[PDB]
Swiss-Prot record, chain A:
InterPro entries per record: Depp_CoAkinase, P-loop_NTPase
Residues noted as binding ATP in the record, renumbered to the chain: A12, C13, G14, K15, S16, T17
Gene Ontology cellular component annotations, sorted alphabetically: cytoplasm
Domain DPCK: 4-201
Family: Belongs to the CoaE family.
PROSITE patterns hit by this protein: DPCK
Name of the molecule in the record: Dephospho-CoA kinase
Keywords, in A-Z order: ATP-binding, Coenzyme A biosynthesis, Cytoplasm, Kinase, Nucleotide-binding, Transferase
Pathway: Cofactor biosynthesis; coenzyme A biosynthesis; CoA from (R)-pantothenate: step 5/5
Functional summary from the UniProt entry: Catalyzes the phosphorylation of the 3'-hydroxyl group of dephosphocoenzyme A to form coenzyme A.
Gene name linked to the record: coaE
A GO BP entry: coenzyme A biosynthetic process
Keyword Transmembrane helix: no
Curated annotation (Swiss-Prot), chains B, D:
Binding, ATP: A13, C14, G15, K16, S17, T18
Stretches assigned to coiled coil: none
A single GO cellular-component term on record: cytoplasm
Role according to the record: Catalyzes the phosphorylation of the 3'-hydroxyl group of dephosphocoenzyme A to form coenzyme A.
Protein name listed in UniProt: Dephospho-CoA kinase
Organism: Campylobacter jejuni subsp. jejuni serotype O:2 (strain ATCC 700819 / NCTC 11168)
Functional pathway: Cofactor biosynthesis; coenzyme A biosynthesis; CoA from (R)-pantothenate: step 5/5
PROSITE patterns per the UniProt record, alphabetical: DPCK
Gene3D superfamilies: P-loop containing nucleotide triphosphate hydrolases (3.40.50.300)
TM spans (from-to): none
Keyword Transmembrane helix: no
Amino acid sequence: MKNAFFVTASIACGKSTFIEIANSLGFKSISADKIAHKILDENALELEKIFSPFSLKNLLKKEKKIDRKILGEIVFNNKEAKKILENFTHPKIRAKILEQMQILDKENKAFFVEIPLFFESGAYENLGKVIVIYTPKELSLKRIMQRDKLSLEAAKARLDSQIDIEEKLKKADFIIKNTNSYADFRQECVKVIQEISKGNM
Amino acid sequence: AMKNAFFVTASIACGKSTFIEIANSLGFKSISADKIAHKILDENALELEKIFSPFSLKNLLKKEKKIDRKILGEIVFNNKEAKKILENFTHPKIRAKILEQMQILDKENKAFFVEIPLFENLGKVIVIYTPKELSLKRIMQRDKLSLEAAKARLDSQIDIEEKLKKADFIIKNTNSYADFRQECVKVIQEISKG
Amino acid sequence: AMKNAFFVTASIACGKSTFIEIANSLGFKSISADKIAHKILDENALELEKIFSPFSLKNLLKKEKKIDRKILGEIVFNNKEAKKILENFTHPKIRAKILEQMQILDKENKAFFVEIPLFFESGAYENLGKVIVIYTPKELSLKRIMQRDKLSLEAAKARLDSQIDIEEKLKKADFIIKNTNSYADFRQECVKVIQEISKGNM
Amino acid sequence: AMKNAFFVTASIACGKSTFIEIANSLGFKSISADKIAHKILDENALELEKIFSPFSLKNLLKKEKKIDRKILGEIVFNNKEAKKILENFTHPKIRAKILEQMQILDKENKAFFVEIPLFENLGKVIVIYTPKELSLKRIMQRDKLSLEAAKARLDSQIDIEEKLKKADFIIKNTNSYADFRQECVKVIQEISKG
């Protein structure tokens, strides 16, 4: 598809701000996150059957709404549980996303799919062009311990993620740098959408 | 080995917990991997807020610096990197905590029971056993599951069968609950004389 | 992207090599993924010695800028860090050399076959061309594997898991050649498909 | 739990082997993860050929029904599935033998050294330390590695650094070999009485 523009981001707030802006300028946005969530609610009753032997704490919260707090404990506690939920959810997530992305490509106006950087349900780099809002960060262990004031284990944790973020840029189509002030980052999203808006991208 | 340590594994969840509750009610101490993990997350709540606050636009602390396990589960759900980053931070701490806790209890010269993490030469083994045709087809059609989901479940079933081999005690989690309950006490009684 | 490219992969090794023996005889070009892979280790023999020598007291280099593949495999089997480095070292080199030799034969405008191990690593090759899986169905029953194949629980588990994974991989094949019956019958089928391809009919 | 168990881990491989050699010459036994694994492979050669014969046209067994470890690396190299199957089958048996062995030597009431597997609240920790500017940038240029490769290396470096915190013996891997050796012997004498 041709009007498909994923928007993902090294920091979660970049993701959303660009989405706030594209919206006002008369463009439409799908939220991969809202979709995934929607999935868990529509299959409540099968989810309870599948996951209930894993706990005594009931999975259904009310009238066919799934207890997410409980489900996330179950998968965190239980590697079998974790693989079953993954495989149960991937096809459904993939399928819904891909459904709505054909609803709008045909509508022939550029559209944006807002999606977390390491979202699992497929390899979406095929479907459209990817926009990654990247904030480059220090990859030095010591400087993060001193900066954000952390133990080694927590700095390890933070550093491994920033290193894994930078790798993902090899998969991007458009990178918007986000190293300067809020209002300044803002205009750059504005500029980009415009270029998309006249077939320049 | 480690003298008084007993690991409990069950085919179904509610077997385990029935055993461990009964053992508790008869004065025996137990360690819960799930509960260890839970305290680890609160014990590290602030660290986690900084590691994981760029992933979401929601506050990861709920009130009085405790961690929101709803939100952490959301940030983690369907995210390869957040799963990995959390696992790698927490799993080490969980392992150590367990081992630390095993050693203490062992020094009290009374049998105690460790619920094996679902994230052993070290002690003796009790498996709470519920027979099952170890069959991918049965699992798929009974439980209504895909191919790879069923294999996850099947591999857990095979893991228990493996343990049946050198189990020091096997407790059949039969169709009669009340029976199975008294199958537990007799084991615990036999454990207590040694 | 390439029209003349066919991946040949198999649920068991002889399935793949027979379809290739027959494809060659019928005059079509094949490249081997594992051969290309093996040659990457030798072309980068000096750099690998530097990177991996700190994991062993032994020598990686066997003779004249050649890699002792026995030792290197012991290193990566014994060391998680070595394994990841090797994977990241080789993957892009394998990927560009495979994609080097497939753009040669695609413009050469005759059908060709990339022999490849079913779970090969160095990229997602499904998007480059068409995938031919030679499949031999199996009973996904633990107990029937211990009997027939005379194995312990543990080894049966391994065998069963791999079979399950194999079936998973078909969800991404374009063309599945069954392989349940005799040798002879399997060979005929290869020829029927290679022909159907030969006409550009497939 | 095991009073006599000492775990050795080093920043570079040769620090670890020097120290173990010196400890072996002074009469202290040692457990090699790498050797245990080696023995598991030969122990299970028959089953391994049956698991792995569908991956390769080659013979996986040598004369004297020994495993062919060249051929098994060829089948596993760049094959995600063969790796997983091999790791899943062997790793448990390796871990069990490590502990089975640890427990036997600890009954001899003599200090012994466990070479930590590179594929620890059960004993004491000896870290054989070679300081390093724990920087990804330095690792990529000093070692000629890409982003993810240097990451794997860096991560290993941080794991050594995590164990500096509570280690019982830290031995600097100086720039003199000779003295580093002397650093080893004092430690081992230190350990020999207490």
